[PDB]
Amino acid sequence: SFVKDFKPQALGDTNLFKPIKIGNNELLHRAVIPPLTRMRALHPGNIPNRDWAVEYYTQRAQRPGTMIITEGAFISPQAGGYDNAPGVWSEEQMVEWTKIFNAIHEKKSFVWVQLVVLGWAAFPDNLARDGLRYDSASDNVFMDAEQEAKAKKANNPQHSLTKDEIKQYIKEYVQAAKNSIAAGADGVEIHSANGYLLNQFLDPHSNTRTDEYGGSIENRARFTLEVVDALVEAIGHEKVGLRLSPYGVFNSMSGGAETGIVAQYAYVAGELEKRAKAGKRLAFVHLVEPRVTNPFLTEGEGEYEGGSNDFVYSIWKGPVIRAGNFALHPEVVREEVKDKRTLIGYGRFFISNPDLVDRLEKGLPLNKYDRDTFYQMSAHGYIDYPTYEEALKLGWDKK
Amino acid sequence: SFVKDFKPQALGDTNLFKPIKIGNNELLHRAVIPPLTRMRALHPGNIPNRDWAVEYYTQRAQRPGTMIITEGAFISPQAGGYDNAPGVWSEEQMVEWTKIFNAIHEKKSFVWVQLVVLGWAAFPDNLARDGLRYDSASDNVFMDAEQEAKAKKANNPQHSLTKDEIKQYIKEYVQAAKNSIAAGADGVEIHSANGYLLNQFLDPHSNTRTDEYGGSIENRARFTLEVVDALVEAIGHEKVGLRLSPYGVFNSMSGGAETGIVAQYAYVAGELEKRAKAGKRLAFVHLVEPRVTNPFLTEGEGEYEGGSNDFVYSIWKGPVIRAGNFALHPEVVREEVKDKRTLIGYGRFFISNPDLVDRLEKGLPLNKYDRDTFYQMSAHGYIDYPTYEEALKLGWDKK
Ligand SMILES: Cc1cc2nc3c(=O)[nH]c(=O)nc-3n(C[C@H](O)[C@H](O)[C@H](O)COP(=O)(O)O)c2cc1C
Ligand SMILES: Cc1cc2nc3c(=O)[nH]c(=O)nc-3n(C[C@H](O)[C@H](O)[C@H](O)COP(=O)(O)O)c2cc1C
Ligand SMILES: C=C(C)c1ccc(C)c(O)c1
Ligand SMILES: C=C(C)c1ccc(C)c(O)c1
Ligand SMILES: [Cl-]
Ligand SMILES: [Cl-]
Ligand SMILES: [Cl-]
Ligand SMILES: [Cl-]
Ligand SMILES: [Mg+2]
Ligand SMILES: [Mg+2]
Ligand SMILES: [Mg+2]
Ligand SMILES: [Mg+2]
Ligand SMILES: [Mg+2]
Ligand SMILES: [Mg+2]
Ligand code: NA
Ligand code: NA
Ligand code: NA
Ligand code: NA
Ligand code: NA
Ligand code: NA
Ligand code: NA
Ligand code: NA
Ligand code: NA
Ligand code: NA
Numbered sequence: 001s002f003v004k005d006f007k008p009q010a011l012g013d014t015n016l017f018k019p020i021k022i023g024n025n026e027l028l029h030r031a032v033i034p035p036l037t038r039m040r041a042l043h044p045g046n047i048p049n050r051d052w053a054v055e056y057y058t059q060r061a062q063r064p065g066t067m068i069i070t071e072g073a074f075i076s077p078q079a080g081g082y083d084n085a086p087g088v089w090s091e092e093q094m095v096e097w098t099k100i101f102n103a104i105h106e107k108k109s110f111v112w113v114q115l116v117v118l119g120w121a122a123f124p125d126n127l128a129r130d131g132l133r134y135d136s137a138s139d140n141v142f143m144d145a146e147q148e149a150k151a152k153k154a155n156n157p158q159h160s161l162t163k164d165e166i167k168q169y170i171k172e173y174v175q176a177a178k179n180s181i182a183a184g185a186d187g188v189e190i191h192s193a194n195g196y197l198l199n200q201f202l203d204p205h206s207n208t209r210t211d212e213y214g215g216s217i218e219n220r221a222r223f224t225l226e227v228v229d230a231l232v233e234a235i236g237h238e239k240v241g242l243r244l245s246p247y248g249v250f251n252s253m254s255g256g257a258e259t260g261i262v263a264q265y266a267y268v269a270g271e272l273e274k275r276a277k278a279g280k281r282l283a284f285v286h287l288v289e290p291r292v293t294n295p296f297l298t299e300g301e302g303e304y305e306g307g308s309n310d311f312v313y314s315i316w317k318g319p320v321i322r323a324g325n326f327a328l329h330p331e332v333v334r335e336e337v338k339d340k341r342t343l344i345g346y347g348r349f350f351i352s353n354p355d356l357v358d359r360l361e362k363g364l365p366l367n368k369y370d371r372d373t374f375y376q377m378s379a380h381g382y383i384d385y386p387t388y389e390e391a392l393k394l395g396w397d398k399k
Numbered sequence: 400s401f402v403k404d405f406k407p408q409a410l411g412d413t414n415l416f417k418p419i420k421i422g423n424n425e426l427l428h429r430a431v432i433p434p435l436t437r438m439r440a441l442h443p444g445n446i447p448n449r450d451w452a453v454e455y456y457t458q459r460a461q462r463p464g465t466m467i468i469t470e471g472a473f474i475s476p477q478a479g480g481y482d483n484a485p486g487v488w489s490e491e492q493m494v495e496w497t498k499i500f501n502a503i504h505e506k507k508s509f510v511w512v513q514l515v516v517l518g519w520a521a522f523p524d525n526l527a528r529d530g531l532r533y534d535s536a537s538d539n540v541f542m543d544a545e546q547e548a549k550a551k552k553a554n555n556p557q558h559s560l561t562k563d564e565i566k567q568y569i570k571e572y573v574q575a576a577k578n579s580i581a582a583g584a585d586g587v588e589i590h591s592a593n594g595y596l597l598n599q600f601l602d603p604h605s606n607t608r609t610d611e612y613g614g615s616i617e618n619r620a621r622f623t624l625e626v627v628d629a630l631v632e633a634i635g636h637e638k639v640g641l642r643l644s645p646y647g648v649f650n651s652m653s654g655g656a657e658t659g660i661v662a663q664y665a666y667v668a669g670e671l672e673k674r675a676k677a678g679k680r681l682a683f684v685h686l687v688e689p690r691v692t693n694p695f696l697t698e699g700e701g702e703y704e705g706g707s708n709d710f711v712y713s714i715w716k717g718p719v720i721r722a723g724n725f726a727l728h729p730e731v732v733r734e735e736v737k738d739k740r741t742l743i744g745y746g747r748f749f750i751s752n753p754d755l756v757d758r759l760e761k762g763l764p765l766n767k768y769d770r771d772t773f774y775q776m777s778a779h780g781y782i783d784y785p786t787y788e789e790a791l792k793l794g795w796d797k798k
Contacts, residue, residue: 217616217666259669259676262714266662267616273658311710315661 001399002365002391009330010363015337016344017361019065022319023187023238023283025110028065030337031357034286034323034345035069035114035189035243039375040382041086046074048086048096054103055383060350061109062387063357067343068104069189069286072116075176078132079169079197081122084377088113088176094183101184112187112241113180115173119197120158120206121251124151133159137200137207137214143252166213166223169197173227174234187239188231192224192268193288194295195251202264205254217260217267225271228282237280241321244268245288247304255293256307269315276318284319286345287312292324295347299325313339321345327356327366355387364388365397400798401764401790408729409762414736415743416760418464421718422586422637422682424509427464429736430756433685433722433744434468434513434588434642438774439781440485445473447485447495453502454782459749460508461786462756466742467503468588468685471515474575477531478568478596480521483776487512487575493582500583511586511640512579514572518596519557519605520650523550532558536599536606536613542651565612565622568596572626573633586638587630591623591667592687593694594650601663604653616659616666624670627681636679640720643667644687646703654692655706668714675717683718685744686711691723694746698724712738720744726755726765754786763787764796 011017016030038056040049049056061068074080074087087093097113104111120143124134134151139160142148151157161169177188192198200206201223207214213222224242231240246265249255258264272282288295290304303325312320323345326333336342350356352369359366365388373381386394410416415429437455439448448455460467473479473486486492496512503510519542523533533550538559541547550556560568576587591597599605600622606613612621623641630639645664648654657663671681687694689703702724711719722744725732735741749755751768758765764787772780785793 217662256713259672259714260666261669262710263616263662263665263669266665266710267659270658270660270662277658306716307713308709310707311661311665311713314655314706314710315658317705 001368002396003328003368006328006366008359008363008365009334010361011330011333012361014334015340015342016333020319020341020343022067022343023241025067025186026065027067027110029063029357029361030343031066031360032321032343032345033060033066033068033350034321034347035072035191036347036351037071037085037375038382039082039084040377041084043083045090045092046080046083046085046087047092048100050096052379052383053096054099057100057111058103058107059354059383061104061107062355064108066109066357067112068109069112069114072114072191073176075115075117075169076172077130078135079117079172081118081124081126081132083126084375088115088179089172094179097180097185098183105184110186112189113185114189114191114243115176115180116191117169117197119200120147121196124156124158125154128154128156135159135161135165135197137161137197137209141206141208160209163211163213170226170230174230177231177235177240181235181239187241187283188235189241189243189286190224190227190231191243193243193245194248195253198224198227199245199248199251199253202268203253204258204260204264206252217264220264221268221271224268228272228275232275232280232282237275237282240282241284241286242272242282243286243288246309247290247307248288248293249302250294250296256290256304262307262311266311266315269312273316276316281318284321284343285312285316286321286323289322289324299328299348319343323347330360352385354385359388367391367396400767401795402727402767405727405765407758407762407764408733409760410729410732411760413733414739414741415732419718419740419742421466421742422640424466424585425464426466426509428462428756428760429742430465430759431720431742431744432459432465432467432749433720433746434471434590435746435750436470436484436774437781438481438483439776440483442482444489444491445479445482445484445486446491447499449495451778451782452495453498456499456510457502457506458753458782460503460506461754463507465508465756466511467508468511468513471513471590472575474514474516474568475571476529477534478516478571480517480523480525480531482525483774487514487578488571493578496579496584497582504583509585511588512584513588513590513642514575514579515590516568516596518599519546520595523555523557524553527553527555534558534560534564534596536560536596536608540605540607559608562610562612569625569629573629576630576634576639580634580638586640586682587634588640588642588685589623589626589630590642592642592644593647594652597623597626598644598647598650598652601667602652603657603659603663605651616663619663620667620670623667627671627674631674631679631681636674636681639681640683640685641671641681642685642687645708646689646706647687647692648701649693649695655689655703661706661710665710665714668711672715675715680717683720683742684711684715685720685722688721688723698727698747718742722746729759751784753784758787766790766795
């Protein structure tokens, strides 16, 4: 069915429908597919789904000139810990990714691989089964009691990374980025958001280190910036973006309760701008808005009203993608896209609307999403959401 | 004469005319007199002007419930270096300040002493004459070539403060604050803006130190925060405010060209909010806007459009005074005061309009200021600017 109480607005008369260049890619509109984990990859080997993933991405690439950021992809076995999320370290994985990228490109759209390291969000028992550590910034603060207990039960207590192990992750980011580009991707996004490993280093709650990787703003940002620099060197700044969620609380990050949080993220933005002014400007910065501090809460819940991401625009002067509860709020989008370097990521409603871009242009009703199939091993709730035309044929205008 | 091309707007229907409590003081409106050095103090001894200062402040206190921040006042001889700016270290000074404070209070208005240490902005030859150092954060970067040369010619080269000398300034801030309160002031403002000593520590251009007072965001903020903490302890948080100018370039500060500048100031704001949440909230934060990066340039010049002070509001949750080119822009004030904890400082047009508050309420023409008498040893351009009534009697409506 369509979302019942929603009053759509046509956004075709706004900058959402003006072309913009992101990295090497000439986008034809500014509605971006943010990274969306869907848990259809198959075990063993974290293989992108051989039956359905091509169709899923093909459907969502249908509007020419769309920027798609993939579901998060693990850079190595040690970076993972969810059996049904994909990786980008192995030949078999890349066989499937190549098909996905080719399909997106045949639709005249673009694809950026999000590179993920889970840290304390991983399942410690999966990691123990596979002979892998359970990693984070620190060893004395935990995501939650259940994770701590699971790690102990698995004889795999949370481990604070050594400098050597940080370097090994950096090597894996580099190789994952190379693999992604060689397989045909347009670029990569470094996931430094939503409470995963890099965010665990950024945040003073999760990072109690006293070496060069913690204990100050510069130190907490060090790992993120080393990854940025390593990827810029390996594949070029025009092929690299960075995702941040300053106000996020998902995965036990601090959000606005931490009075130093804006400074921490302002420092990162400033360091990116310094690199840009020195000739190496990242393709984009992607921000999760305080509109959505936890993306598993229904739209309108978990909204933080005590902060804005606007500060980033005073500092970073390149493209900015903003995501969080924008599908149901075209009136907010209309205002934000008056800024000529702002793009809008639409997550949950791109899950349910393969033709979302047309719907945004034309002010059409939106398909309701089914949260129960966000993570499910099924084509249902993955590739069977209808286009607007298909929904009319199903009678959804009368449901 | 009145400003010729100005189209006034009555602001009586805005929050500019709603009462607000700042520290211990119940303000009746939100038009603040920011600190304005006028150079009428007499030498020797940096004595507030015995003939005219009471009248100057009495005139500008005329609207009941006005918050006045004094001209900058030196905390000690070593903190000074301009012969005609006042101090707050000596009995003779305080005799004159007591008369000023009493006069302001008789008009049912309030007075906060701005506490100043000049650093590299001081005149090194005046300091040498008096047996005093020429101080800054560093010894290898200078305000400008003329200052560097004057210091060398005076056998008083710029000196990088020792930790002991920083502590001595802190002792002087404490005693100056005590003196101010004992003489009847309502509070003090710590000047950490406009390129004076504390700002010289905040800014990475002027602060090349490698000890605990430089080399990182936390370290550059250390001296400012030590002064805050010392004054809060001495006289109470309700009697202390802090002035900052994130985007200022006056006195050779970096402004927005420094990509880390927002982070530096976000850190300070965050540390103030942390103290507030722990029970010691400063009375206010006073910000100079990027509207005026140098207050000796005509309104509209030196405007930085690449940044906003709005970030501070995501971090610090108390009152905020904003200053910079607001008198000529009631349309901007009307928007900013929609925020219910925002006050507006009016500098140059309070020099020329003793009854500015009435003029703002009622949308009256403004007296043009005379920059040539901003710093002059004269009653002219100090105490002889007319009220609106007086200006009408002079025929200024027909000039
Ligand atoms: C099912 C689901 C999976 C997600 N997976 C990822 C991910 O792999 N990487 C990521 O950075 N964010 C991920 N997110 C967060 C989204 O990219 C997005 O920031 C969030 O859903 C807010 O946007 P929305 O309100 O448009 O959905 C996910 C969100 C959902 C609901
Ligand atoms: C003559 C003059 C003297 C000033 N003296 C001081 C001072 O003692 N302390 C201070 O913090 N700012 C001082 N300022 C800066 C003002 O407080 C204010 O921030 C600036 O003039 C911008 O506001 P305006 O456009 O309303 O004048 C001075 C400015 C002027 C023009
Ligand atoms: C890579 C995965 C599993 C993922 C899931 C959800 C979110 C919000 C995310 O950032 C990442
Ligand atoms: C204390 C003095 C001399 C002063 C003068 C001008 C400005 C802008 C300031 O901040 C301070
Ligand atoms: Cl619904
Ligand atoms: Cl799993
Ligand atoms: Cl004029
Ligand atoms: Cl002088
Ligand atoms: Mg251990
Ligand atoms: Mg906005
Ligand atoms: Mg169902
Ligand atoms: Mg020397
Ligand atoms: Mg504003
Ligand atoms: Mg003259
Ligand atoms: Na419409
Ligand atoms: Na099938
Ligand atoms: Na802005
Ligand atoms: Na789950
Ligand atoms: Na269905
Ligand atoms: Na009017
Ligand atoms: Na006289
Ligand atoms: Na705000
Ligand atoms: Na002068
Ligand atoms: Na005159």
